[PDB]
Amino acid sequence: EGTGAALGVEEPLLFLPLILIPSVFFILFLGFSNKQPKDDFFGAKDDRRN
After folding, report:
1. Reduced to 3 states, what is the DSSP secondary structure of residue 18?
2. Alpha-carbon distance 14 to 11, whole Å?
């Protein structure tokens, strides 16, 4: 093409799978993140990861 539209989105229907599939796995990622330790560790690479 070469028009230059941001993210190749000329058609507005392409914001359907671009805003949903990240926010489907984001809710899955929040199921992992909310069950974590949330304690300021020291050193690097904390490995509790419940």
Report:
1. helix
2. 6
**Helix, strand, or coil (residue 14):** helix
Neighbour-count burial for 9-20, b at 16+ CB within 10 Å, e otherwise:
eeeeeeeeeeee
Closest-CA residue to 35 (of 25, 50, 20): 50
| Dihedrals phi, psi of 46, to nearest 5 degrees | -60, 140
What was the structure determination method?
cryo-EM
Which token pair is 15? Answer: 């914001």
CA distance 15 to 5: 13
Resolution (A): 3.2
